Design a binder for this molecule. Structure first.
Ligand SMILES: [C]OC1=[C][C]=C(C2=N([O])C([C])=[C]C3=C2C2=[C]C(O[C])=[C][C]=C2O3)[C]=[C]1
Ligand SMILES: [C]OC1=[C][C]=C(C2=N([O])C([C])=[C]C3=C2C2=[C]C(O[C])=[C][C]=C2O3)[C]=[C]1
Ligand SMILES: CSC[C@H]1O[C@@H](n2cnc3c(N)ncnc32)[C@H](O)[C@@H]1O
Ligand SMILES: CSC[C@H]1O[C@@H](n2cnc3c(N)ncnc32)[C@H](O)[C@@H]1O
Ligand SMILES: [Cl-]
Ligand SMILES: [Cl-]
Ligand SMILES: [Cl-]
Ligand SMILES: [Cl-]
Ligand SMILES: [Cl-]
Ligand SMILES: [Cl-]
Lengths: 381, 381
């Protein structure tokens, strides 16, 4: 009574959509290393034997797209035709043009940096929950950690039959406490991972339970009733882009809160800070985490929105789920007194010209590695 | 006091991401017209002069991709190099292969149709709100209708300077009533639309207020304080794929609830019913709308989740926001007694082999045209 199930998923570095996010952000980083003011909107498409870059870049950088793309694919682990994809021998196609001059003139040309317009309209949410130290939903944290564990055991040669493409999914039973949520138990785990032609299904299922799940999920959450769907398709030899076409910005819920909170639809990867889809979403996470770590609420949702060419947000909204003694109006006044959510100020506060974006493009953008948006602001009120 | 702002956006038929959704669904429909059991996973990429199809189709259909793609672009209105894109003369590139045999064997081969596995893992939400007759958030309904009005005035020659690429955004001030939400006023409207080189900015801004906003938004929601950002970039001559690379499944919040409810991350367009990203999301909307229209709640969120190769959902969750006298446990029992959320049963209930998908791929998948998932089920309990 008063309990509910909630499910989140994550994917591995070799999931074809995630390959595209990582390549898009490798391209962004390569530009920012030479030109901190590069305007980048780099979409990636992946299918059998092909990486295509499509989009708009205006930059002073001299970037070797062949090297940047192939080094990203090498890092992921696609290094042989036996695995379905090889950085050494794949096709890299480029359909990149300058940023539209109409966008440039409306957003940033002859603008003071602090007063640059939003690079697009849109809406963005931030979310934080006190249910974990990293202020993230346990469902998504566990799902990410299961993919990270697969990559670790592949890379260290423990499970050498593993290939880079994986997906995981975690269902947790929760109770509610005055709008806060408390995780009780893991109800169901799914793991699907690409594998070689030698290993049999029983060996894989045993290894996924004993060397992956048991190495990630605390035993206090697992019981005799927990349901395991391990290699539920029965065979996953074909994988990566050969199994499924990938695109940049097709894992936006994996990238954020795993179904919790809300999403405004904007993808992160391949975009410089003037694209508020990324900078304002990072800032909204920073606000949400600052409110929870500051002790003002246990759980909070922040919405912001923008118009192309306009610096200041068009709307700011705060929902505390009943977990603050302060009114949502009082929290909004604290946020307005402590934060400046113009993209040309967010860039300074969160250091968003730094080429750290490829690091964000797997295992979620939030809840790890003390990125600037994960370091709470000390609030004055 | 007790009021809040909430923002949603929509895009027009010529927005490059939406072009891709419509082409992906034109391809799906072309297959289903000949082979109701076609397995389709068709991604589309659009950039200057290029439509690329990438993905996996196993089908008995004989499909002319050149004709299907070009007819979709013609319908959208890109018919001349002056508009930045022309169905007659663009490049159509195809990178389509058979569905992975590993997926096919794990999902549907030698399966009874009712007992087909989910085509992937994932999570999906349904949402419904009594704030409009169509059980959708007013923010998203108004945003969609503003884009539909632009297309209408372009196509009827009223505003012949209009081009197909548009975006809109609506901020509404709401009050809450025991978990239900009541829209009070329109706080801010954004409209950006591609235009010709002849029309001046003041003519466009006047027309967008008088012939678009006033023709869509009831005057009772507008006042002297309503903020209008009309052509806020100042110039939008370059547009469509020339202005911004488009991809299938990059408008998933426009396609659904405009930030309300929740999203599990799955894109709809280009996918047959075995892909639960589409079929289970449609079924979850159907459940949510059935609960609200059945008088069991004013507002409701439904989560379901799946594992690849497994027919039945792994989890089902119901949140009524405090708007039911029934417990969320009692609502879950009503749902379990009235619905079968296996994809091989959803296909029968919602007629998902019918080639109606291109019609879903602009102006939202929900809240219009009495699609099967918009016709409430009469509930027995
Ligand atoms: C988005 O995201 C989410 C939302 C909401 C939630 C919740 N909250 O918050 C509270 C307080 C309580 C509850 C809930 C739920 C949900 C469900 O399903 C979906 C069921 C039941 C329940 O209960 C969560 C999550
Ligand atoms: C997702 O989606 C959403 C969620 C939630 C909501 C709400 N609910 O429900 C209630 C009852 C009340 C409230 C809310 C809000 C929000 C905000 O922002 C975001 C602010 C404030 C407020 O309040 C909505 C929407
Ligand atoms: C079902 S295709 C969608 C995603 O599922 C994964 N996938 C691909 N092939 C299989 C398979 N044979 N079994 C399980 N998951 C798969 C890959 O991560 C792919 O991007
Ligand atoms: C800002 S690029 C993202 C989207 O905004 C729109 N857009 C493109 N160019 C402009 C412009 N000059 N002004 C306003 N919106 C634009 C198009 O719909 C594009 O897909
Ligand atoms: Cl790299
Ligand atoms: Cl923790
Ligand atoms: Cl400030
Ligand atoms: Cl058509
Ligand atoms: Cl209505
Ligand atoms: Cl039933």
């Amino acid at each position: 009574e008063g309990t509910f199930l909630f499910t989140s998923e994550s994917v591995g570095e070799g999931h074809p959509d995630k390959i595209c996010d990582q390549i898009s952000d490798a391209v962004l980083d390569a530009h920012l290393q030479q030109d901190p003011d590069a305007k980048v909107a780099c979409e990636t498409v992946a299918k059998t034997g092909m990486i295509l870059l499509a989009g708009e870049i205006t930059s002073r950088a001299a970037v070797d797209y062949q090297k940047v793309v192939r080094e990203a694919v090498k890092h992921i682990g696609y290094d042989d035709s036996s695995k379905g994809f090889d950085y050494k021998t794949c096709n890299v196609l480029v359909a990149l043009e300058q940023q539209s001059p109409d966008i440039a003139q409306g957003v940033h040309l002859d603008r003071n940096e602090e007063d640059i317009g939003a690079g697009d309209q849109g809406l963005m949410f931030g979310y934080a929950t006190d249910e974990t130290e990293e202020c993230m939903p346990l469902t998504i944290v566990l799902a990410h950690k299961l993919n990270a564990k697969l990559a670790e055991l592949r890379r260290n040669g423990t499970l050498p039959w593993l290939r880079p493409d994986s997906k995981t999914q975690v269902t947790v039973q929760y109770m509610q406490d005055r709008g806060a949520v408390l995780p009780i138990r893991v109800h169901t785990i799914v793991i699907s991972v690409q594998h070689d032609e030698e290993v049999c299904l029983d060996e894989m299922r045993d290894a996924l339970k004993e060397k992956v799940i048991k190495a990630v999920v605390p035993a206090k959450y697992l019981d005799e009733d927990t349901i395991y769907h391990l290699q539920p398709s029965g065979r996953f030899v074909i994988g990566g882009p050969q199994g499924d076409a990938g695109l940049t910005g097709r894992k936006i819920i994996v990238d954020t809160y795993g179904g919790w909170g809300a999403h405004g639809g904007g993808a992160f990867s391949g975009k410089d800070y003037t694209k508020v889809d990324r900078s304002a979403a990072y800032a909204a996470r920073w606000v949400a985490k600052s409110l929870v770590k500051g002790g003002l609420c246990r759980r909070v949702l922040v919405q912001v929105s923008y118009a192309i060419g306009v610096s200041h947000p068009l709307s700011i909204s705060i929902f505390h789920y009943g977990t603050s003694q302060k009114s949502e109006r009082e929290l909004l006044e604290i946020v307005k007194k402590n934060f400046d959510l113009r993209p040309g100020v967010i860039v300074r506060d969160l250091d968003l010209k730094k080429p750290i974006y490829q690091r964000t493009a797997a295992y979620g953008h939030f809840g790890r590695d003390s990125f600037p948006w994960e370091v709470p602001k000390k609030l004055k009120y």
